[PDB]
Every structure is written in C-alpha cells, then in structure tokens.
Amino acid sequence: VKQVFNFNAGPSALPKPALERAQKELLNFNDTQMSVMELSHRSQSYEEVHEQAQNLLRELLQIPNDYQILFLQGGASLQFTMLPMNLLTKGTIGNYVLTGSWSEKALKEAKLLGETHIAASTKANSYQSIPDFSEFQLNENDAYLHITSNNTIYGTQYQNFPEINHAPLIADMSSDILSRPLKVNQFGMIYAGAQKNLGPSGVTVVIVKKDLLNTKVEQVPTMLQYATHIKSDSLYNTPPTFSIYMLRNVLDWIKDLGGAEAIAKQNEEKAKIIYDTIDESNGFYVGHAEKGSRSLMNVTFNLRNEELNQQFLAKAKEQGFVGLNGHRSVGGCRASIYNAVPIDACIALRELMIQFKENA
C-alpha cells in the first residue's frame, strides 16, 4: 500500500468529513429512506439541500443580497461561451485580461460571438506574472472586462483585484474561489467549476449580480440564458443533485473549520512550505511564476531538464503522490494545493523534493 498525497488539479482532494458524511447517508438521506441521488429535484427534501448550499456559500463569502447563486452544468468551459452570449451585444466589446491558458480559452469563445479586445496580457512574459492594472486598456463600449483570478496551468494568481466601474468585472475563479475572503461587490459575475475548491465535478457555481443578467436575451437558447436560471433558481431543468449535495457538505466543512479567513491561513502556510523548498534549492527546482504573482493554489515548477523532471515524477508516483505532473500543455510539475489538500501532504512533498535533490 502507498500513502496518498493528492495534488490533483481538478477534480481534486475532498475533505474527509464531507466524504464520510456522504458515505454514511448514501442509502438513506435525512430519514427519507432514499439516497439524495433518488430524490426529485421538485421535492422539498431536495430543495432544502439546494437552498442550504446557496446559503452556506452566501455566509462564507459574504455575498450581498443583490447577488444570486446559480448552480449550472457544463463546467467553467460552458461559461466561456454563455457569458458573451448573454452580454456581448452588437456595438459592445468583450474585453479580456490574458494571464494564462484558461484566459485564452475564454477569449476564444467570445471571438466567435462578437468583437473582443485584450486589455492587458503577460503572454509575452510567458504568463509568469499578473499585469499591472495601470496597463489595462479599457473601452467605453466594453460589455465587460474578464479576468482569470487564478491561472491554474501557469501557477499565477491575482493578489488583489482591479477597481472597475466602467463596465461589469467578470472573473473565472475556478481554481481559487473560496480559498480566501473575497469582496464580491467588486464583480458583476464570478464563475467556477466546483471540482477544484467547492466539491466534485458536475456543477459550476455562478455568483451573479441579479440586475446585470436577469433579462432575457433575444435569440439565445433557453438553457444558455442566465435569466432562465435566475428566474428558476437553478431549477429550470434537472440540476446535478448529488454534486450540489456534495458542495453543501464541503461548504459545511469550510464553515466548521472557521470559514474563509481560517482556510486562507492554512492555504498560505501550505504554499509557503513548497515555495520555500523551491527558493532554497539553489535552482534545482525553478518556479514558473514570478514571486510577486505566485499562486497559493497551484505551484508550478521544473527541474533542470526533462530527464530530471521525469525521474522526479516517477519517484513521486512510486511514493504515493498523485497528480504532480504539470498540465500536459506545459509539462513540468504542478502541485495543486486547494483547500482540502492537507498541509501534511505539502510536508511530504517537501521531503520528497529534498531527498530527490540530495540523491541526484
């Protein structure tokens, strides 16, 4: 048997209490004698779980009342197209800040639907940094300005957010939502696939300023209108009921541990273990990110050559590390250290790194 150190990038490690709770009641949820998986989405029993998940997110992120929490299917990827479908109208511009591959994927879908613009980009700096907000090129007819808060593939992250008042600020927060407190009122819309930091795959969380998106859009398919899901409270069609249930369990765990401030402290400590190991390695491990733009959620690094990368990753696999290979598009290594990844897995990664360097 191998120990498990789960550095998977999404889906990812879950809190053991959330899983254990799910296991215990999998056949009989809340004395109904049915699994949560067997309930109608039109039942009170399910509605209670759906509402509880929203209310927990609201409490934990301090979401103001004029925002609504949607639970959608399709991943963050579907949001790449649904956002411009809803807001990118003739005469306006979808303005994007490019800070990684996920930013590019979002921009690509907007280009199919309307005029786009690049407000700022660190592509020429190999996505090693977040641009200075003073670099942002904005347009009066921007439909929105879109950012990617945590650039999962490159391991960079916004340390704080721009103050934008000329157009709605929109963020793909898939890989750092609820890793720390967040001033939601800075944004018109936030979206996140749940499978990094909120739960399992199969549901996408969208926090939307209601008045921004609660109007039907001409000619847009029913399922692709935010208004449909706003009006229907994410019950227009059949939701991913078990995913939402698991989201509820994960949010309860975050609340039990002390909320967003407590998890931020844990995440900062975890990240420091790994970054100090990189920095103290005299170049044996080299981080992709510039220090000032380092992600607390995905730590990306390389050894001095591909042969060493491969040897390191093979050793890691032998020793029980899961998911440490970088995203296939970039190679290297990526330690994903979302909320539920335990600090002791980070300690183990440090030990592996120190030993590998000494035995090289």
253 is catalytic: no
β-partners of residue 144 are: 94
**CA 214 from chain center: how many Å?**
24
In the complex, least distance from residue 276 CB atom to Na ion, rounded to whole angstroms: 4
Q: Which residues bind Na ion (CB under 5 A)?
A: 275-276, 279
Question: How many Cβ atoms from other residues are within 10 Å of residue 82's Cβ?
Answer: 23
Q: Binding partner of residue 276 among a copy of itself, Cl ion, Na ion, none, CB under 5 to 8 Å per kind?
A: Na ion
Residue 152 assigned to a binding site = yes
Q: Binding partner of residue 309 among Na ion, Cl ion, a copy of itself, none, CB under 5 to 8 Å per kind?
A: none
Considering only residues 61 through 100, tell me which ones interact with Cl ion, judged by CB under 5 A.
100
Residue 344 assigned to a binding site = no
At position 43, the amino acid (one-letter code) is S
- Measured from the CB atom, the residue of 80 and 158 that comes closer to a copy of itself is 80
Give yes or no for residue 268 binding a copy of itself (CB under 8 A): no
Considering only residues 298 through 327, tell me which ones interact with a copy of itself, judged by CB under 8 A.
322-323
176 is catalytic: no
Give yes or no for residue 202 binding a copy of itself (CB under 8 A): yes
Give 222: exposed, middle or buried? Use CB within 10 Å, 0-12, 13-18, 19+.
exposed
In the complex, least distance from residue 251 CB atom to a copy of itself, rounded to whole angstroms: 15
- Measured from the CB atom, the residue of 255 and 357 that comes closer to Na ion is 357
Catalytic residue among 142, 176, 196, 209: 196
Give yes or no for residue 217 binding a copy of itself (CB under 8 A): no
**Strand order in 298-302's β-sheet?**
286-287, 298-302, 333-336
Binding flags for a copy of itself, 57-96, as an x/- string (CB under 8 A)? ----------------xxxxxx-xx---x-----------
Q: Binding partner of residue 153 among a copy of itself, Cl ion, Na ion, none, CB under 5 to 8 Å per kind?
A: Cl ion
255 vs 303: CA distance, rounded Å: 38
Q: DSSP H helical segments within 169-234, as ranges?
A: 210-213, 226-231
270 is catalytic: no
Catalytic residue among 2, 111, 132, 172: 172
Q: Binding partner of residue 154 among Cl ion, a copy of itself, Na ion, none, CB under 5 to 8 Å per kind?
A: Cl ion
Task: Specify the DSSP class assigned to residue 131.
Answer: P
Q: Do the beta carbons of residue 162 and residue 133 sit within 8 Å?
A: yes
Pick one of 145, 178, 246, 271: the residue that binds a copy of itself (CB under 8 A). Answer: 246
169 vs 335: CA distance, rounded Å: 29
Query: Is the peptide bond prior to 168 cis by the omega test (within 30 degrees of 0)?
Result: no
Considering only residues 25 through 54, tell me which ones interact with a copy of itself, judged by CB under 8 A.
26-27, 32-35, 37-43
In the complex, least distance from residue 318 CB atom to Cl ion, rounded to whole angstroms: 28
Contacts with 351 (C-beta within 8 Å, 6 or more apart), sequence order? none
Number of residues that bind Cl ion (CB under 5 A): 6
Q: Please name which of 281, 253, 263 lies closest in space to residue 358, comparing C-alpha atoms.
A: 281
- Length of the chain measured in residues: 360
Classify 16 as helix, strand or coil.
helix
Question: How many Cβ atoms from other residues are within 10 Å of residue 344's Cβ?
Answer: 12
List the binding residues. 42, 76-77, 102, 152, 172, 195, 237-238
List the binding residues for L-glutamate. 42
Q: What is the set of active-site residues?
A: 102, 172, 196
